[PDB]
């Protein structure tokens, strides 16, 4: 009865409209919750019988490192989706655009100026500022990747982290940044708004040096019993309705092509953030690009 969720979303993005998806289609739909790496290591272990349903969440098209854990399928709404951000990947289906952003807390920040990856270097913020463990996050090795984008150079890496407080949790960095233990984090563009829209003292910055822009993936778990409603669930997610709801209450970035843009206040449009090409960021597998930095 139950559908099985694995998400590495917080709650508050991906719980109501999954509770709409209960209202809707009469189903009860748990959620397993943990950062990105981590949902998928553990899941690998998992007994093929316990195993749930759908994977949402994460740049799965390019960090699913045991695709033998999945279910070759993509949402036929494909089509509709914008054309450069669709899937490569025969597991995946793209569901949001996350940017990946620095935060900066605005009440400890003063005059200090904080464009973007080079001015987290300046002396004065040395061991304080936070990031998320790349090895196990989604948005900690991305922003790696951004960092290591900008000339090619794992000593551009290195430098930033010797500089830097790593934390085992991606939502520990907004969490500590809007709560004065750090002047800067590097964060997404979801858990920013979150803290921001609470009232923290939070500045979003999109770094000018080149924004990584996550391609967030859906996919399904190969299991013994697959509930028979978890294409239903992945349709849902990627339909026009929903994808328009994501965008009018929470600033999203669709991956549709009819699906209104949406970036009230200090959220920027795609169209003004400074993306890293793609051509800035060519194949290299994920354990190999860790082991590079390492
Ligand atoms: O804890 P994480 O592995 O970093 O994942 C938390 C979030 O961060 C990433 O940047 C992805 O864009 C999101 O889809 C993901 O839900």
Known sequence: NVLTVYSPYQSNLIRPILNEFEKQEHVKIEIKHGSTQVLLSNLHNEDFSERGDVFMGGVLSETIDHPEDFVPYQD???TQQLEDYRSNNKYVTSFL?????????????????????QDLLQPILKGKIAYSNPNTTTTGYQHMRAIYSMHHRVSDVHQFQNHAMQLSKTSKVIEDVAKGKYYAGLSYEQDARTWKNKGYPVSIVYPIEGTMLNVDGIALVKNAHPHPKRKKLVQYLTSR??????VAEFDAKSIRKDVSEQSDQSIENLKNIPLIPKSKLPDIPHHKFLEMIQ
């Open 97 to 117: 655009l996350m940017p990946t952003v620095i935060v900066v807390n605005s009440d400890l920040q003063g005059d200090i100026k904080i464009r973007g990856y």
């Open 76 to 78: 036929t709404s494909v």
């Open 241 to 246: 309705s929903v994808q328009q709801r994501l």
